[PDB]
Point group: C2
Chain length 156, copies 2
């Protein structure tokens, strides 16, 4: 239920191991920096950071091309830690300043399937972008909490 | 040293995604709204603070470990009376850093992993929490079990509240 929204999750790979290695002082510095970078890039594509998960973010966009372009630019900027990015779209409930519903959970699982450095999108996102964006042929996976399988597409 | 000492409690609903898929978004939103208010109310009764939400769970801060455990116990009692959702609870203490409306640092991450280890319906606490509550006349623990926690080297003994 709810309004249609594109949901993007970012997540740092193995952030606990990282925190343990470099220590809390360096980690807070790092994540503050990362937060500012992500916020900047999200805003450039007219997105809004909805919520923090500590070593990652939940971001809302009106259009799928905005989300994917944001993901592309974030990976580019990081190459200048490894981050996984997943993107899904569908109706979700935007209540208080949070997002809820099965399509939020699905975006979350799509991000969880992504490798560090990868941008993964669900089939609805892929099908909506058939403007400067190329995809692989997809991979079929089971997603925790959902029945059956889903084809997820990596951005090239 | 960086950070203020705090007791961190995480709650998490077991298999919330599958639950959401069963009951639908409308009923889910109503359910988690009710859950949010239940947790918030019980937390404030033990002088705690809900720091942040993880959708189907919360990060909560307490000054004292007795407060966190009493809260956990009361929450499980409330959830039993209500019953269907099962909530896992994990508690750890140490210094952590506040940034915005969230807590950061290895001891937050540790609390998170202690919670992840807990079964639905269970309260697990780390060894420092158990040790801090040795003298308590009301709080009782089991003998503990050794685990390894993602992101951390070595092993850690975790204790269930009885
Ligand atoms: N501030 C804040 N931190 C959170 C929240 N939810 C989770 N965390 C933190 O997120 C971290 C755990 O993230 P994970 O991604 O599971 O851990 P990881 O070590 O990165 O492992 P992988 O991503 O699986 O490689 C812990 O530090 C948690 O304390 C939140 O809502 N707010
Ligand atoms: N609103 C909100 N939701 C979050 C946040 N972090 C994670 N989530 C949600 O948390 C849910 C996934 O939680 P999990 O505990 O991994 O899923 P689960 O199905 O309960 O699985 P188990 O706990 O392993 O049994 C998804 O619905 C995510 O969208 C957050 O910061 N804010
Ligand atoms: Ca991570
Ligand atoms: Ca859960």
């Amino acid at each position: 239920m709810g309004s249609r929204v594109v949901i993007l999750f970012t997540d740092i790979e193995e952030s606990t191991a990282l925190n343990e290695r470099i220590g809390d002082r360096a980690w807070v510095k790092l994540i503050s920096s990362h937060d500012k970078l992500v916020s900047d890039l999200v805003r450039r594509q007219s997105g809004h950071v909805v919520e923090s998960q500590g070593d990652g973010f939940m971001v809302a966009f009106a259009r799928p091309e905005q989300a994917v372009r944001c993901g592309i630019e974030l990976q580019r900027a990081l190459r200048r830690i490894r981050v996984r990015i997943g993107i899904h779209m569908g109706r979700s409930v935007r209540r208080g300043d949070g997002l809820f519903g099965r399509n939020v959970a699905m975006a979350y699982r799509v991000a969880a399937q992504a490798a560090g450095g990868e941008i993964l999108v669900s089939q609805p996102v892929r099908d909506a972008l058939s403007d400067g964006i190329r995809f692989d042929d997809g991979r079929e996976v089971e997603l925790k909490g959902f029945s059956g399988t889903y084809r997820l597409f990596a951005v090239l």
